[PDB]
RNA sequence: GCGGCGG
DNA sequence: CCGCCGC
């Protein structure tokens, strides 16, 4: 089935939790630009007509791929609602 | 590949003084085995027209010099009286099966395309008998029997086959 | 191909006129072929005499009913939407009180439909069928009481619905209980009314009961006689004048309520035999001489007391016994409504007797065809009984032509009560197929009738038997009535015979629905043939004897859905009815008399009879069936041929050579493939597509009307308002599309213009094909019925070729149904030692669970036929046997392997290898030569088969053969709409469709739950918002996607908004609130 | 700022509030005028009282000021007269 | 809403 | 239960 869905589930306290993080994260991948990733170096996702999955095929695939690693953090109230989107636009073209 | 009867517009029509229906006829035409002799012959159009009290057989096609019809006595139709049948049937050299819907040939706006049956072989069979000569009895003796409609020959096919096999074998060349 | 049949049970008499049901029923219904001097006694004329002698003094009598000039012809009735009816009038004469004067004249009273040579009707354009009906044959029965296990109650039931429902019950507290229509009253009360005096009554009645103490009781009301008639009237619920107003009592006298069924056998049969004995008149009718005669009442009670007393004759009546069940033939059905019209007319004429100047009134002043026409017309076009003629294929229509229904008038049987009726009753033997019933709700309630089953004088499906005397069997056949069959000891046809003499001591027979082993001396009657036990429909399954009844059904019903294939092949193995079905069904055209052929056109066939007549038989070229299937007649005769009487001149739709054929015989290996034949999937060889093996022609009839709006008449012309010329090519004829054109989805089939515009019949998404026929009905209508407002009509017939593809579903006569999963290239599919590859591969697994060995049998015999090049005819229960098949298979080994020995070669190393695994399997007797071995393995019905992909054998013999399989009216053309976006309802905001846009599947709550459970939050949100009501949501969504973006967030669904307001619209004030209870804005 | 809708409330309507949600008062009974599909004024379809006919219109309300009072059938004919029970007058007659 | 079929 | 086809 899916890549380390097992690992994923073990990282959250509840199933549905996983989905939410996964999603919203896919949102940020496209909204604030598609370079807002954390594992772009060697070993980033990919497709087969050419090696172009390096730009924007499926967002979620990235999310999960990124969450599989200890790069991102998710919590009930980590960062003040509005401040998050303001800082993100600034540091991502 | 395609057919056209003069007064017929659709494949589901009926021609006066002609027992068989368009569909029954075109069907019989896919049973027609023609044989060209050179690449220069990609698309040949056989023409035939007979009238009155007669039985139309594949030999009634007006000779096309280099290309020959080994399907002579094939029954094309039965004509009563005042049975006017003039038609042009398009032929082609191809490979495999092609649905009349896939190609959709249109020589004349009112002609109806026919289904493509390109395999010049009806059946292949091979046997593996025990022995001819050798130090050890555990040996294989392959004899294969091929059947052809006539277009090409048993040997001819076998060879082409063998070639297509070889052709593919080479495709193992450049790694990546 | 030689035709060998294995029938050993001397089939004594040929099957009857399969459609006789309807045919004859209408003939006798309306005796219009023969003069009135010997005019019938039933149907039309009877219904006439019924309500004709009119007496209001006025006197209008019946003379003769004549009809016969059909306005137009059949086909014309179809092409013009015209109903094929006959004109009906009749001579009526009015006699006057003035004995010296009378009036004769004729008045045409509407048109009545006619019956086709096939047995079908033609109402408004299309062909319809009047299906049979079953019920409690109006008679008298005695059934056990509801709760009280004590004594039983009497029932008196006579149709029509207007007639009273009478019951008779005796209670503890006291006396009789005779309840009519929701109320009860003393059984004596009436008796006294009629003349039955306490004395006479008790004596003859209680001379054995002791219950009588129930009747003779009136010591108060029983001493007044006529006064009891008035007494009874008071017992009517309504307050009415006590002045002898027979009225409601007049009702249950002689005229309306009871029945006008033919005097003698209609209701009287239930009388004479069942209870009491003689009938006077038609029913308990005698309102003559101030006093009344009711020769029916006392007997009913006279049996009640017998019933509760001794064994004067044990009458416990089994309701469902077909012997108290009548079947309503078309005739009785039409005639019924006919007399209703007769009544409706007789209603106004009596009103028109007091209404005018004496002799000033003549025929017209008394007759108005208004009642009768609406009457009849209503039945054929509105009655829940007349339906679309299921013509997927001839057979189909034929079944639908003879099936029996329980639901209908409502007074015979309803929906929620049937567990009892649904069972195949004991009596259904040879009278109702036990297999023909449909699966699902409505089971056992609607079913087709048996083989020889033919309706007698009044319904009771009779069946044929063979009287036998001593050890001698006769050909003298009698059609017994369900009830009469119980009196005897009938025996099976399987009983060994030496011509006319029985052959065994313990010879089976069935007493009364009970299996009993009787002696040759006691066999009074014998079964005609095993056939009669089932239906025509069922009688078509080869080895039915080896097939579970449950799946056999699936098998019967499936034939009804077979679709006409261009190349029609009769089953490699048949039952023996195929010939007959095509024959009594009217698919093919036969030669009347001996003679010779003249012209054998592809449109007509003209032959010269040796008697002195030359006829031209046109052949329906390519007609559109009701279900959209091809119906062509393909001449099978050459110019100048001496034809035998009753020989196929041309073949019908699926009947080629005169045999019935639906689908084709294909070589089939019975094994498992990857998963392509997983649960019920089937694998097909591209090779089949190549020889157009499975290809059916289909037609879709798109219709457009030039409506007349008060905004300006919708003209029909080549003028297409938006400027296209590339889409106006095919539309060459000004307005119409040209014959022979290729119409694709979205092209204009017909153009039209209407007021504020292009309103044009276009090719509905899905497909079109080639336009083949066109019909236009302009102003000066020849003889067509153009609806009102309808300026002119345009009909466009389109057709295309259906080649078998992956979605399509086929199935064999036994019940194996399935869809095509993968179309394999001959290249790598299961091939036999000799180059011959198989056509289809059936998954073995679907045979054990379902119980239908019959298919595995057909396949074995089918294997013999392939190499023996012969077709066989195996009777229902009497067909081919396991030994005889092995015999023919042995013959087949010499063709298969025999030519193999001469052609020059022996056994493969592969053939030897599978033989090893076969002997270790126990299929072959260890120690014999491969030659001998393979034969023994072939006889088992299994041969060796090499993969085709690997060329390596498939360890273990696999069975293969010629199995007859059909394609069903299931094309995937009706199975796939793919909608991205489009039209929405303007009233509710739903993505409804119509012309270019498909509809969206519904989601129902049943599926929402599904989602809820998953925790599919947004997936659910999306289904109720972005995809349905938030007009701004779906909008943002669309845009976003156009942008390759991320759909916006949901705003308050208009449903929320719309609710706040709907709630504001009323006192109620729905206010949404924030965290801390405060306001929040949707807007 | 803007808050997730967590609670919804049904209350009675003060005549003052009826005027509150209200935009203009429909003062006249002129459904459709043929001359211009353009709405005939101050009946039902007027645009001030509801809004602009061209390219939030179907979200405003209007009020009709009744001469002498009338009552809500919903509060008078419901099995238990909400007003008949409360007031103590014959509840239903 | 009536009727017919399919799962 | 859902999907279709037609007065």
From Swiss-Prot, chain A:
GO terms for molecular function: DNA binding; DNA-directed RNA polymerase activity. It catalyses: RNA(n) + a ribonucleoside 5'-triphosphate = RNA(n+1) + diphosphate. Keywords: DNA-directed RNA polymerase, Nucleotidyltransferase, Transcription, Transferase. GO terms for cellular component: DNA-directed RNA polymerase complex. Its EC number is 2.7.7.6. One of its GO terms (biological process) is DNA-templated transcription. Gene3D superfamilies: 3.90.940.10. SMART domains: RNA_pol_Rpb6 (SM01409). The RNAP catalytic core consists of 2 alpha, 1 beta, 1 beta' and 1 omega subunit. When a sigma factor is associated with the core the holoenzyme is formed, which can initiate transcription. Promotes RNA polymerase assembly. Latches the N- and C-terminal regions of the beta' subunit thereby facilitating its interaction with the beta and alpha subunits. Belongs to the RNA polymerase subunit omega family. This is DNA-directed RNA polymerase subunit omega. It comes from Thermus thermophilus (strain ATCC 27634 / DSM 579 / HB8). The gene is rpoZ.
From Swiss-Prot, chain B:
DNA-dependent RNA polymerase catalyzes the transcription of DNA into RNA using the four ribonucleoside triphosphates as substrates. GO terms for molecular function: DNA binding; DNA-directed RNA polymerase activity; protein dimerization activity. It catalyses: RNA(n) + a ribonucleoside 5'-triphosphate = RNA(n+1) + diphosphate. It comes from Thermus thermophilus (strain ATCC 27634 / DSM 579 / HB8). This is DNA-directed RNA polymerase subunit alpha. One of its GO terms (cellular component) is cytoplasm. The gene is rpoA. One of its GO terms (biological process) is DNA-templated transcription. Residues 1-176 are annotated as: Alpha N-terminal domain (alpha-NTD). It comes from the Bacteria. Keywords: DNA-directed RNA polymerase, Nucleotidyltransferase, Transcription, Transferase. Homodimer. The RNAP catalytic core consists of 2 alpha, 1 beta, 1 beta' and 1 omega subunit. When a sigma factor is associated with the core the holoenzyme is formed, which can initiate transcription. It is an enzyme of class 2 (transferase). Belongs to the RNA polymerase alpha chain family. Its EC number is 2.7.7.6. The N-terminal domain is essential for RNAP assembly and basal transcription, whereas the C-terminal domain is involved in interaction with transcriptional regulators and with upstream promoter elements.
Curated annotation (Swiss-Prot), chain C:
CDD domains: RNA_pol_B_RPB2. One of its GO terms (molecular function) is ribonucleoside binding. Its EC number is 2.7.7.6. GO terms for biological process: DNA-templated transcription. Gene3D superfamilies: 2.40.50.100, 2.40.50.150, 3.90.1100.10, DNA-directed RNA polymerase, beta subunit, external 1 domain (2.30.150.10), DNA-directed RNA polymerase, subunit 2, domain 6 (2.40.270.10), RNA polymerase alpha subunit dimerisation domain (3.90.1800.10), RNA polymerase Rpb2, domain 2 (3.90.1110.10). One of its GO terms (cellular component) is DNA-directed RNA polymerase complex. It comes from the Bacteria. It catalyses: RNA(n) + a ribonucleoside 5'-triphosphate = RNA(n+1) + diphosphate. Keywords: DNA-directed RNA polymerase, Nucleotidyltransferase, Transcription, Transferase. Transmembrane segments: none annotated. PANTHER family: DNA-DIRECTED RNA POLYMERASE I SUBUNIT 2. NCBIfam families: PRK00405.1 (NF001616), rpoB (TIGR02013). DNA-dependent RNA polymerase catalyzes the transcription of DNA into RNA using the four ribonucleoside triphosphates as substrates. HAMAP family: RNApol_bact_RpoB. Belongs to the RNA polymerase beta chain family. The RNAP catalytic core consists of 2 alpha, 1 beta, 1 beta' and 1 omega subunit. When a sigma factor is associated with the core the holoenzyme is formed, which can initiate transcription. This is DNA-directed RNA polymerase subunit beta. The gene is rpoB.
Swiss-Prot record, chain D:
Belongs to the RNA polymerase beta' chain family. DNA-dependent RNA polymerase catalyzes the transcription of DNA into RNA using the four ribonucleoside triphosphates as substrates. This is DNA-directed RNA polymerase subunit beta'. The RNAP catalytic core consists of 2 alpha, 1 beta, 1 beta' and 1 omega subunit. When a sigma factor is associated with the core the holoenzyme is formed, which can initiate transcription. The gene is rpoC.
